[PDB]
């Protein structure tokens, strides 16, 4: 989880900072330290949904939850999460989760991938937040989605220099980890 500089060198930049972490209390700290989006990604669904619930009770706005299963995303949505991140690995099963969430009426579906063509298809199928996952020079994926017309492009990297370049290429959400 990031060095103290990553978060510091980004708080300078209509850009939003997303903060990802395994337990909610450092997520809550981030919420008042200025973080715009709090990503719950603990894979214990009991603990995960309880972190969503506590963040809603704490008043945190823009709670996000990440999963490969739309049913878990729908439950987190019901318990307070506003941004539902479909974690893509099997692309066809990934796009179907977006389609099902859209059928359920979700309005802030996100999609996490390393391939701009994959994100482009997810965007057409219902995903509004497209997450370029850089875990090389992936900021190039950002430039292509930018050209295709996507309005909310996010970027995740461990390194603030990469986050900055992605911002310069059109990313509006920069994803940092504790």
C-alpha positions as YAML, in Angstrom:
chain: A
units: angstrom
residues:
- id: 1
  name: UNK
  ca: [0.00, 0.00, 0.00]
- id: 2
  name: UNK
  ca: [1.24, 3.38, -1.18]
- id: 3
  name: UNK
  ca: [4.02, 5.47, 0.26]
- id: 4
  name: UNK
  ca: [2.94, 8.63, 2.07]
- id: 5
  name: UNK
  ca: [3.99, 10.63, -1.02]
- id: 6
  name: UNK
  ca: [1.55, 9.08, -3.51]
- id: 7
  name: UNK
  ca: [-1.52, 10.52, -1.77]
- id: 8
  name: UNK
  ca: [0.33, 13.80, -1.08]
- id: 9
  name: UNK
  ca: [1.48, 14.41, -4.66]
- id: 10
  name: UNK
  ca: [-2.09, 13.92, -5.95]
- id: 11
  name: UNK
  ca: [-4.11, 16.04, -3.51]
- id: 12
  name: UNK
  ca: [-2.86, 19.01, -5.52]
- id: 13
  name: UNK
  ca: [-4.94, 18.04, -8.55]
- id: 14
  name: UNK
  ca: [-11.90, 18.96, -10.75]
- id: 15
  name: UNK
  ca: [-9.95, 15.72, -10.28]
- id: 16
  name: UNK
  ca: [-11.08, 13.11, -7.73]
- id: 17
  name: UNK
  ca: [-9.03, 10.82, -5.53]
- id: 18
  name: UNK
  ca: [-10.26, 7.30, -4.83]
- id: 19
  name: UNK
  ca: [-8.84, 5.52, -1.78]
- id: 20
  name: UNK
  ca: [-8.72, 1.73, -1.68]
- id: 21
  name: UNK
  ca: [-8.14, -0.26, 1.50]
- id: 22
  name: UNK
  ca: [-9.02, -3.52, 3.22]
- id: 23
  name: UNK
  ca: [-10.55, -2.13, 6.46]
- id: 24
  name: UNK
  ca: [-13.00, 0.74, 6.78]
- id: 25
  name: UNK
  ca: [-11.41, 2.83, 9.50]
- id: 26
  name: UNK
  ca: [-8.44, 4.02, 7.47]
- id: 27
  name: UNK
  ca: [-11.02, 4.49, 4.72]
- id: 28
  name: UNK
  ca: [-12.98, 6.72, 7.11]
- id: 29
  name: UNK
  ca: [-9.83, 8.69, 7.97]
- id: 30
  name: UNK
  ca: [-9.31, 9.25, 4.24]
- id: 31
  name: UNK
  ca: [-12.92, 10.45, 3.83]
- id: 32
  name: UNK
  ca: [-12.33, 13.50, 6.03]
- id: 33
  name: UNK
  ca: [-8.78, 13.89, 4.81]
- id: 34
  name: UNK
  ca: [-10.40, 14.82, 1.45]
- id: 35
  name: UNK
  ca: [-10.84, 11.50, -0.38]
- id: 36
  name: UNK
  ca: [-13.75, 11.65, -2.81]
- id: 37
  name: UNK
  ca: [-14.35, 7.89, -3.31]
- id: 38
  name: UNK
  ca: [-13.82, 5.13, -0.74]
- id: 39
  name: UNK
  ca: [-13.30, 1.69, -2.31]
- id: 40
  name: UNK
  ca: [-14.26, -1.31, -0.18]
- id: 41
  name: UNK
  ca: [-12.49, -4.39, -1.56]
- id: 42
  name: UNK
  ca: [-12.20, -6.88, 1.34]
- id: 43
  name: UNK
  ca: [-13.29, -10.27, -0.04]
- id: 44
  name: UNK
  ca: [-15.01, -11.43, 3.14]
- id: 45
  name: UNK
  ca: [-18.48, -10.34, 2.04]
- id: 46
  name: UNK
  ca: [-19.65, -10.21, 5.66]
- id: 47
  name: UNK
  ca: [-16.86, -7.80, 6.56]
- id: 48
  name: UNK
  ca: [-17.19, -6.06, 3.18]
- id: 49
  name: UNK
  ca: [-20.89, -5.28, 3.50]
- id: 50
  name: UNK
  ca: [-20.38, -4.19, 7.11]
- id: 51
  name: UNK
  ca: [-17.73, -1.69, 5.97]
- id: 52
  name: UNK
  ca: [-20.18, -0.31, 3.39]
- id: 53
  name: UNK
  ca: [-22.85, -0.04, 6.10]
- id: 54
  name: UNK
  ca: [-20.55, 1.76, 8.54]
- id: 55
  name: UNK
  ca: [-19.32, 4.20, 5.89]
- id: 56
  name: UNK
  ca: [-22.94, 5.10, 5.09]
- id: 57
  name: UNK
  ca: [-23.60, 5.62, 8.81]
- id: 58
  name: UNK
  ca: [-20.47, 7.78, 9.06]
- id: 59
  name: UNK
  ca: [-21.85, 9.93, 6.24]
- id: 60
  name: UNK
  ca: [-19.18, 9.01, 3.70]
- id: 61
  name: UNK
  ca: [-20.32, 9.84, 0.19]
- id: 62
  name: UNK
  ca: [-19.26, 7.96, -2.94]
- id: 63
  name: UNK
  ca: [-18.79, 4.53, -1.41]
- id: 64
  name: UNK
  ca: [-17.49, 2.02, -3.95]
- id: 65
  name: UNK
  ca: [-17.44, -1.76, -3.79]
- id: 66
  name: UNK
  ca: [-15.47, -4.12, -6.02]
- id: 67
  name: UNK
  ca: [-16.38, -7.68, -6.96]
- id: 68
  name: UNK
  ca: [-16.44, -10.11, -9.85]
- id: 69
  name: UNK
  ca: [-20.08, -11.03, -9.08]
- id: 70
  name: UNK
  ca: [-23.02, -8.74, -9.87]
- id: 71
  name: UNK
  ca: [-25.04, -10.29, -7.05]
- id: 72
  name: UNK
  ca: [-22.49, -9.14, -4.48]
- id: 73
  name: UNK
  ca: [-22.42, -5.72, -6.15]
- id: 74
  name: UNK
  ca: [-26.22, -5.50, -5.97]
- id: 75
  name: UNK
  ca: [-26.14, -6.31, -2.27]
- id: 76
  name: UNK
  ca: [-23.48, -3.68, -1.60]
- id: 77
  name: UNK
  ca: [-25.56, -1.21, -3.63]
- id: 78
  name: UNK
  ca: [-28.59, -1.97, -1.46]
- id: 79
  name: UNK
  ca: [-26.52, -1.44, 1.73]
- id: 80
  name: UNK
  ca: [-25.09, 1.92, 0.72]
- id: 81
  name: UNK
  ca: [-22.54, 1.69, -2.08]
- id: 82
  name: UNK
  ca: [-23.04, 4.06, -4.97]
- id: 83
  name: UNK
  ca: [-20.26, 3.00, -7.35]
- id: 84
  name: UNK
  ca: [-20.25, -0.68, -8.33]
- id: 85
  name: UNK
  ca: [-16.91, -1.87, -9.72]
- id: 86
  name: UNK
  ca: [-17.10, -5.00, -11.88]
- id: 87
  name: UNK
  ca: [-13.64, -6.58, -11.71]
- id: 88
  name: UNK
  ca: [-12.95, -8.00, -15.18]
- id: 89
  name: UNK
  ca: [-10.74, -11.05, -15.80]
- id: 90
  name: UNK
  ca: [-12.96, -13.31, -17.93]
- id: 91
  name: UNK
  ca: [-14.13, -10.57, -20.30]
- id: 92
  name: UNK
  ca: [-17.35, -12.15, -21.56]
- id: 93
  name: UNK
  ca: [-18.50, -13.04, -18.05]
- id: 94
  name: UNK
  ca: [-17.39, -9.52, -17.07]
- id: 95
  name: UNK
  ca: [-19.58, -7.75, -19.66]
- id: 96
  name: UNK
  ca: [-22.56, -9.87, -18.61]
- id: 97
  name: UNK
  ca: [-22.23, -8.57, -15.03]
- id: 98
  name: UNK
  ca: [-22.44, -5.02, -16.39]
- id: 99
  name: UNK
  ca: [-25.48, -5.99, -18.45]
- id: 100
  name: UNK
  ca: [-27.23, -7.51, -15.44]
- id: 101
  name: UNK
  ca: [-26.45, -4.54, -13.22]
- id: 102
  name: UNK
  ca: [-27.87, -2.25, -15.90]
- id: 103
  name: UNK
  ca: [-31.03, -4.40, -15.97]
- id: 104
  name: UNK
  ca: [-31.26, -3.98, -12.18]
- id: 105
  name: UNK
  ca: [-31.10, -0.21, -12.69]
- id: 106
  name: UNK
  ca: [-27.60, 0.68, -11.47]
- id: 107
  name: UNK
  ca: [-26.40, 4.11, -12.63]
- id: 108
  name: UNK
  ca: [-22.72, 4.23, -11.57]
- id: 109
  name: UNK
  ca: [-21.30, 0.94, -12.81]
- id: 110
  name: UNK
  ca: [-17.53, 0.80, -13.04]
- id: 111
  name: UNK
  ca: [-15.39, -1.69, -14.90]
- id: 112
  name: UNK
  ca: [-11.76, -2.52, -14.14]
- id: 113
  name: UNK
  ca: [-9.46, -3.75, -16.92]
- id: 114
  name: UNK
  ca: [-6.07, -3.37, -18.60]
- id: 115
  name: UNK
  ca: [-7.37, -3.24, -22.19]
- id: 116
  name: UNK
  ca: [-9.08, -0.15, -23.59]
- id: 117
  name: UNK
  ca: [-11.09, -2.23, -26.08]
- id: 118
  name: UNK
  ca: [-12.46, -4.24, -23.18]
- id: 119
  name: UNK
  ca: [-13.34, -1.05, -21.31]
- id: 120
  name: UNK
  ca: [-14.87, 0.38, -24.49]
- id: 121
  name: UNK
  ca: [-17.27, -2.54, -24.79]
- id: 122
  name: UNK
  ca: [-18.15, -2.28, -21.10]
- id: 123
  name: UNK
  ca: [-18.81, 1.44, -21.57]
- id: 124
  name: UNK
  ca: [-21.25, 0.71, -24.40]
- id: 125
  name: UNK
  ca: [-22.94, -1.97, -22.30]
- id: 126
  name: UNK
  ca: [-23.59, 0.27, -19.30]
- id: 127
  name: UNK
  ca: [-20.41, 1.07, -17.39]
- id: 128
  name: UNK
  ca: [-19.91, 4.79, -16.76]
- id: 129
  name: UNK
  ca: [-16.60, 4.71, -14.83]
- id: 130
  name: UNK
  ca: [-13.85, 2.99, -16.79]
- id: 131
  name: UNK
  ca: [-10.87, 1.91, -14.65]
- id: 132
  name: UNK
  ca: [-7.54, 1.48, -16.43]
- id: 133
  name: UNK
  ca: [-5.49, -0.86, -14.24]
- id: 134
  name: UNK
  ca: [-1.75, -0.24, -14.59]
- id: 135
  name: UNK
  ca: [-0.51, -2.85, -12.10]
- id: 136
  name: UNK
  ca: [3.52, -0.50, -17.96]
- id: 137
  name: UNK
  ca: [2.81, 2.77, -19.79]
- id: 138
  name: UNK
  ca: [-0.91, 2.07, -19.45]
- id: 139
  name: UNK
  ca: [-1.71, 5.81, -19.49]
- id: 140
  name: UNK
  ca: [-1.95, 5.21, -23.27]
- id: 141
  name: UNK
  ca: [-5.11, 3.22, -22.63]
- id: 142
  name: UNK
  ca: [-6.46, 6.41, -21.04]
- id: 143
  name: UNK
  ca: [-5.78, 8.43, -24.20]
- id: 144
  name: UNK
  ca: [-7.74, 6.00, -26.38]
- id: 145
  name: UNK
  ca: [-10.81, 5.95, -24.12]
- id: 146
  name: UNK
  ca: [-10.52, 9.73, -24.07]
- id: 147
  name: UNK
  ca: [-10.73, 9.78, -27.87]
- id: 148
  name: UNK
  ca: [-13.69, 7.37, -27.95]
- id: 149
  name: UNK
  ca: [-15.76, 9.74, -25.77]
- id: 150
  name: UNK
  ca: [-15.70, 8.26, -22.25]
- id: 151
  name: UNK
  ca: [-16.35, 10.93, -19.67]
- id: 152
  name: UNK
  ca: [-15.19, 9.26, -16.41]
- id: 153
  name: UNK
  ca: [-11.85, 7.50, -16.86]
- id: 154
  name: UNK
  ca: [-9.99, 6.25, -13.77]
- id: 155
  name: UNK
  ca: [-6.43, 5.03, -13.41]
- id: 156
  name: UNK
  ca: [-4.73, 2.90, -10.77]
- id: 157
  name: UNK
  ca: [-1.00, 2.75, -10.26]
- id: 158
  name: UNK
  ca: [1.31, 2.46, -7.26]
- id: 159
  name: UNK
  ca: [3.45, 5.36, -8.47]
- id: 160
  name: UNK
  ca: [2.45, 9.01, -8.29]
- id: 161
  name: UNK
  ca: [4.47, 9.87, -11.39]
- id: 162
  name: UNK
  ca: [2.31, 7.44, -13.37]
- id: 163
  name: UNK
  ca: [-0.88, 8.76, -11.78]
- id: 164
  name: UNK
  ca: [0.13, 12.27, -12.77]
- id: 165
  name: UNK
  ca: [0.79, 11.33, -16.38]
- id: 166
  name: UNK
  ca: [-2.59, 9.57, -16.53]
- id: 167
  name: UNK
  ca: [-4.26, 12.70, -15.20]
- id: 168
  name: UNK
  ca: [-2.52, 14.68, -17.94]
- id: 169
  name: UNK
  ca: [-3.88, 12.22, -20.52]
- id: 170
  name: UNK
  ca: [-7.49, 12.61, -19.38]
- id: 171
  name: UNK
  ca: [-8.04, 10.53, -16.26]
- id: 172
  name: UNK
  ca: [-10.38, 12.22, -13.77]
- id: 173
  name: UNK
  ca: [-10.25, 9.63, -10.96]
- id: 174
  name: UNK
  ca: [-6.88, 8.61, -9.54]
- id: 175
  name: UNK
  ca: [-6.87, 5.50, -7.38]
- id: 176
  name: UNK
  ca: [-4.48, 5.34, -4.42]
- id: 177
  name: UNK
  ca: [-4.06, 2.59, -1.81]
- id: 178
  name: UNK
  ca: [-3.23, 2.88, 1.93]
...
